[PDB]
């Protein structure tokens, strides 16, 4: 019947594959997959095994995601699946040259490879994405943080982790799928049936993040066939929106990586106007310095609607939003004797919102208040920071008297926003409040004048406040009026 990996799957678009050599005569991909003249490998059916399978995962007639998709093959990996960063750069330059020659259309570059962090390789992925190319990469199979690998750590690419038939992260001995804040989502990557290079009609079962990345590249090609004018920012938000939620048991991931790793498994639901799409981005850990700073930015074509912070020990000095390069950035502050903090941003697709920060200095009275007053402006997030070591109406941000309050005011006449709260007197470990159905979470914070708060972060449409008066989780929920 239909293989398990295709259960969640329901025009001038090219899919470039930078892999090993492929067996183009295979019945699954023949006529649709073109072999380019490109070859740059460090030095016969085992040579074609990896590339043939992945071409079959993307555009396979029987076992493919995007059945009958047009592909173009480049050889950057030898017979043993080994390549170089330099050989990969020349392959990416070959695509840029081909993009200028071939007719204008959506380009998908599948990079089912991984090396260590490479500055030149991530800069090359940045150059292509600025030219309108959708890059889909593998997270790696090292049971490690994908931020240490390239092109997985490139902010402009779509990094894909691997899950099995039970939606659990893939384990292969002492190894398995990579994880972390650099991963966008997960996709089927274990026991994946596809084209075998042994015979022209043979099938083989393979596993890895390469199979998971080929699955997402298949979904992206189907999205770009129906809507050829989709940007990378619009395409990334849809992959997140269409994903299966909370189906991965996070216990497989290390404890410090559970909050950073997205619990998303790739899907393509039945098709079925403008709606608000938001996602969470995590900054790198700031460090043990008392004056260290964690900075979280949003992707180009995206708007930062809120900023939050988190510390595993709770020794922090809050966060703030500030204008930098004509856009808002999330900046978290570490306390004196703190191990470091994370800056957590809320990245949304809200065109021409021109979000501005409105700050009220610490009033030091009975507390600190600020609101959005402009015409057609809505409150999307509340941030607060304090310079002290130890502290002692709707459409409004409320902070501690010794702290400076910040409000994100976005010009969006089509949005209606509301505040939803939930308080617990003696919290065990966390306080939770979620937005209702049809609503999109834009901001997650905690009420001040509280004993011990580790931090706050948004997980999909749920505001999560970490704890160690009732501790209250405050959620700002927005939606389109239609």
């Amino acid at each position, epitope marked *: 019947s239909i*293989p398990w990996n295709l259960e969640r799957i329901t025009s001038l678009v090219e899919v470039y594959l930078l892999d090993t050599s492929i067996q183009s005569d295979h019945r699954e991909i023949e006529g649709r997959v073109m072999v380019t003249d490109f070859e740059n490998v460090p030095e016969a059916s085992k040579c074609d095994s990896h590339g043939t399978h992945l071409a079959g995962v993307v555009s396979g007639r*029987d076992a493919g995601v995007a059945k009958g998709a047009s592909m173009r093959s480049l050889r950057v990996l030898n017979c043993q699946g080994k390549g170089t960063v330099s050989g990969t750069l020349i392959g990416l330059e070959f695509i840029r040259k081909s993009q200028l020659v071939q007719p204008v259309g959506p380009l998908v570059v599948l990079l089912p490879l991984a090396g260590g962090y490479s500055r030149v390789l991530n800069a090359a992925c940045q150059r292509l994405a600025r030219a309108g190319v959708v890059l889909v990469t593998a997270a790696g199979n090292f049971r490690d943080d994908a931020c240490l690998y390239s092109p997985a750590s490139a902010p402009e690419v779509i990094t894909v982790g691997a899950t099995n038939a039970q939606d659990q992260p893939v384990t292969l001995g002492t190894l398995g799928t990579n994880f972390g804040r650099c991963v966008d989502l997960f996709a089927p990557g274990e026991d994946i049936i596809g084209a075998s290079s*042994d*015979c022209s*009609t043979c099938f083989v079962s393979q596993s890895g993040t390469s199979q998971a990345a080929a699955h997402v590249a298949g979904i992206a090609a189907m999205m770009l066939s129906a809507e050829p004018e989709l940007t990378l920012a619009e395409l990334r938000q849809r992959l997140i929106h269409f994903s299966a939620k909370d189906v991965i048991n996070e216990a497989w991931f290390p404890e410090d990586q559970r909050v950073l790793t997205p619990n998303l498994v790739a899907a393509l639901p039945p098709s079925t106007g403008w709606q608000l799409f938001c996602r969470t981005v995590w900054s790198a850990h700031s460090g043990p310095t008392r004056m260290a700073t964690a900075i979280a930015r949003c992707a180009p074509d995206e708007e930062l609607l809120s900023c939050s912070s988190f510390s595993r020990s709770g020794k922090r000095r809050g966060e703030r939003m500030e204008a930098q390069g004509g856009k808002l950035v999330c900046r978290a502050h570490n306390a004196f004797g703190g191990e470091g903090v994370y800056a957590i941003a809320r990245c949304c697709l809200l065109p021409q919102a021109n979000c501005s920060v409105h700050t009220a200095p610490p009033a030091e009275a009975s507390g600190t208040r600020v609101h959005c007053h402009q015409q057609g402006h809505v409150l999307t997030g509340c941030s607060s920071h304090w310079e002290v070591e130890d502290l002692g109406q709707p459409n409004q941000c409320v902070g501690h008297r010794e702290a400076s309050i910040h409000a994100s005011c976005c010009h969006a006449p089509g949005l209606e926003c509301k505040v939803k709260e939930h308080g617990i007197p003696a919290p065990q470990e966390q306080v939770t409040v979620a937005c209702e159905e049809g609503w999109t979470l834009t901001g997650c914070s905690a009420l001040p004048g509280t004993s011990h708060v580790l931090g706050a972060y948004a997980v999909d449409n749920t505001c999560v406040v970490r704890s160690r008066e009732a501790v209250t989780a405050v959620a700002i929920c927005c939606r389109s009026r239609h």
Partner: antibody
Amino acid sequence: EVQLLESGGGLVQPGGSLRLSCKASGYTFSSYGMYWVRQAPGKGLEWIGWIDPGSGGTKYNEKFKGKATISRDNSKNTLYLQMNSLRAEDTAVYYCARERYGYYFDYWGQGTLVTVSS
Amino acid sequence: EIVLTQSPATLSLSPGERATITCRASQYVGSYLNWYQQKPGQAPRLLIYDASNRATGIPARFSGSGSGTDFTLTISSLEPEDFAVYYCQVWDSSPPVVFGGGTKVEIKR
């Protein structure tokens, strides 16, 4: 039209060898793969070997390794078979079949009976 | 290796009645399965290719179905010349070809 003319059938002494041919016509002989398949009466289809008339590349069934040999002559579009040290279990109707790479067996021989008896 | 299991071994039906023969692959083979018909004293004849396509010169009563592991050969109305032996066939790697065991279709009186 595509025709596959077989020859070399008859009686073989036990311990002796069968020597069959398959003359092909109506197509470019190198563009298609060739097989030797046999069938004992009442039993099913048992493949013997394969050859690529372009490369000369061959494959054989493990049960016939060392006993079976397949060769070709592209100048006369003829396929060849030799199966040594025959026993009474080797009595079967032998076929030569053309394969369309990755598709099917489109053309067959008429069927050649080989009986092994002393 | 792939093993093709055919069910049943012998199918006894009356002329005009519908016939269904099953071929089961031990592994995923996609839709690259072929059906052959063999009448006595004759070589096998290509009937269905790519699990659903009728071969050139095959009557419309013959139809194939399936993808993956389960395959079905269907004869809408049994004509008296349709009572023969049927074989399913796929390609593989270690042995380059795999044939089914065979299914004999018998007239029922």
